Amino acid sequence: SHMREIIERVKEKTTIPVYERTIENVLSAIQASGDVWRIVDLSEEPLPLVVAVVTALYELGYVAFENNQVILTRKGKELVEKYGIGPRADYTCSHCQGRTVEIDAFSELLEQFKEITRDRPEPAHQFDQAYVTPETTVARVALMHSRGDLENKEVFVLGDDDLTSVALMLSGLPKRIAVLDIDERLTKFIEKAADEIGYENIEIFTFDLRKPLPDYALHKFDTFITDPPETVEAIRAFVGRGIATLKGPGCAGYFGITRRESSLDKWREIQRVLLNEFGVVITDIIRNFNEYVNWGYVEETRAWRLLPIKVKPSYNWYKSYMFRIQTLEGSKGFEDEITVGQELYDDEESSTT
C-alpha cells in the first residue's frame, strides 16, 4: 500500500526509527503549515527525520514546493483523505502559553531582567548555545518557586546562557546560588550582574562538564537547573552531574528536553537513564515550556545543510519540554569522566550545531 512505500523510502535516508505515526505527524503538520521550520515544530519529530519524510513525500509526488513552502499535491490530498489524517488542531492556553504557570506576579522581575540582560552574550556555536525568552526565564522561576524549590534553597545552575541565575538573584528567593559554564563570557557577565545588584551569596566559576565535579559542588544543594545537549552522554554530563550536586532525597532538578533534536525512541532511553541509572522520579513533563530565541549561527549548522528549503526562521520555532525530577532513597548522580569532543553535542538526531 501507499504508506509502506513511503516508510520504506524514508528508511533509505535515515537511521532514525520510522513508524507510520512519524509520517502522520509530518502530514498533519504540512496541512497546518508550509514552513519547514514549522513542520518540524508541529510534527514534534526530530529535524533530520522530518527532512527524510518530506524528501520521501516529495519524491513520491505527495508534496510540492511553491514559494519555498511545502504543500500537498492532488495525490497528497488523496493520501491524507485515504488514511484519515487531519491537520493537527491546537488548544494551547493563550494566557500561560501552555506553561501551566502565569507570570502576572513577576512583572517587576521581568522588567528588571530585560534591562540587566540587554547586552547579554550572543549564542556561541561551539558551546551549543541558544538562550530562552525573558518570559520563559521568569516562568522557570515561577514554576520552581511554586514547587517549593527556591525559597531559602541552595540552587545550582549547570550552564547558564539563559541567565536563570541572574533572574534568581533578582527574585531574592535562594539562600545561595552556584553557577558554572564552559563559556568565559557568561561567568564574567553573571559576575558583573551580581556586582551591580550587590548580590553576595553567589559562587561563579568556569568549568567543563566533561570533567567530574569537585567536592564543593557535590552533595550540597537543594535544587539544580540545567538546559543540556541531548546526546545520552550529555544527559549524564549535565543532568546526571546536576543530580550529583543534590544533598540527598527530597531535592529537585529542572531541565529542558526537545522533540526537535530527540526522537521518542531517545526519550525512552533518556527516561531509562533517569529512572534506572540515577534512580530519580519524573514529577512533571510540560510541552513547549521553554521558548528559544533564534540564534545567529543557524546557517553554519547541520539543520541548514539538511533542509530542502533554506530560509532563516521567521518565528521562534525551537521549543523544549520542561522536565522536573525529584530525588528519592537510592537516587544518585553521575561522577565519572567523559572524553568525547563534538559528540557531546552531536548525534544522528541533532541538527542545531
Ligand X SMILES: CSC[C@H]1O[C@@H](n2cnc3c(N)ncnc32)[C@H](O)[C@@H]1O
Binding residues for a copy of itself, per CB under 8 A? Answer: 17, 19-22, 24-25, 28, 84-86, 88-96, 98-105, 142-143, 145-146, 148, 151-152, 175, 248-251, 264-265, 267-268, 271-272, 275-276, 279-287, 321, 326, 328-329
For residues 320 and 256, is the Cβ–Cβ distance under 8 A?
yes
Query: For the chain, what is the radius of gyration of the CA atoms?
Result: 21
Smallest distance from the beta carbon of 67 to ligand X, in angstroms?
A: 34
Q: Per rule CB under 6 A, is residue 45 in the interface with ligand X? A: no
Smallest distance from the beta carbon of 144 to ligand X, in angstroms?
A: 17
For residues 334 and 246, is the Cβ–Cβ distance under 8 A?
no
Q: Per rule CB under 6 A, is residue 210 in the interface with ligand X? A: yes
The option from ligand X, a copy of itself, Fe ion, none interacting with 207 (CB < 5 to 8 A, set by class) reads: ligand X
Q: Per rule CB under 6 A, is residue 242 in the interface with ligand X? A: no
Smallest distance from the beta carbon of 42 to a copy of itself, in angstroms?
A: 10
Q: Per rule CB under 6 A, is residue 183 in the interface with ligand X? A: yes
Nearest to 48 by CA among 236, 228, 259, 323: 259
The option from Fe ion, a copy of itself, ligand X, none interacting with 227 (CB < 5 to 8 A, set by class) reads: ligand X
Helix (H) or strand (E) run with residue 168 in it:
helix 164-171
Please, which residue, 207 or 267, has the CB nearer to ligand X?
207
Nearest to 254 by CA among 266, 238, 267: 238
Nearest to 242 by CA among 315, 178, 151, 330: 178
How many angstroms separate the Cα of 213 from the Cα of each of 139, 219, 334? Answer: 28, 11, 9
How many angstroms separate the Cα of 162 from the Cα of each of 65, 149, 208, 252, 303? Answer: 36, 19, 17, 19, 22
**Residue 254 bridge partners (DSSP):** 225, 324
Smallest distance from the beta carbon of 276 to ligand X, in angstroms?
A: 24
Residue whose Cβ sits closest to ligand X: 159
Q: Per rule CB under 6 A, is residue 225 in the interface with ligand X? A: no
List the interface residues with Fe ion, window 68-127 (CB under 5 A): 93, 95-96
Contact residue for ligand X among 159, 174, 240, 253 (CB under 6 A): 159
